[PDB]
């Protein structure tokens, strides 16, 4: 149970290998 909703957005640079993180992830320079 993780709460990615709490962010304004999630940087892909921290998703590590979490598959759900990569679904909503946002790529940055």
């Amino acid at each position, epitope marked *: *149970d993780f709460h990615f909703e709490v962010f*304004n*957005f999630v940087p892909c640079s921290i998703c590590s290998n979490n598959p759900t993180c990569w679904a909503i992830c946002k790529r940055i320079p």
Partner: antibody
Amino acid sequence: QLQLQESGPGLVKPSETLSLTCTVSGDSITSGQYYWAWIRQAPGKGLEWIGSIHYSGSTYQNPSLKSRLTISVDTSRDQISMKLSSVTVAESAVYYCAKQQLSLSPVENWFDPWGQGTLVTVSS
Amino acid sequence: EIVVTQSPVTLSVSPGESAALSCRASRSVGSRLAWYQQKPGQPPRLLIFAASTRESGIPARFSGSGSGTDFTLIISGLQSEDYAVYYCQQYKEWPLFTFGPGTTVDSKR
């Protein structure tokens, strides 16, 4: 060596807006995937997280403060800042900034290292 | 949300003795639990994380243990500089976390 340094007002009037700044030295806020957090502690009171921000601009913040809170990040000065508006008596505290670890592979959430803090008194 | 309590409020410890501080979580947090020390006038300093891993720079007389709900910090051979406030922090639901109320270690008369 990594060091965190809070600056801000010493005293502030109620209903006015508190502005603080954390200055990261001996390192770069863009070095690594860390979050940087503001945390305050009223005297004789526990630890109260205010908000965290990452160099991407990504941020999550305390629900009970978001409507008065703003947290920014300046990678060109290695600084993080916050703003509380309509400040009240309940805002008198030491305001800390600390490096945060927000890792998903091995779930990791904590604060190290912390800065000295900067006391903020609120009085008419 | 997950509530961490602590026990006791003030722990009196004579120097050289061994301090056992408790921290109980309302649900299961696994091993996702840190301990902090706050000497008076200073910021918190991280002591333990993942419930037993002692941070680099921390004296080995500080040791953390437990899993699930009930946790423990032990100060074996208490030094004077160790009179401080101790907080625990749980972090099970990433990126959510909660701080404990704090336990104070003071001198024993």
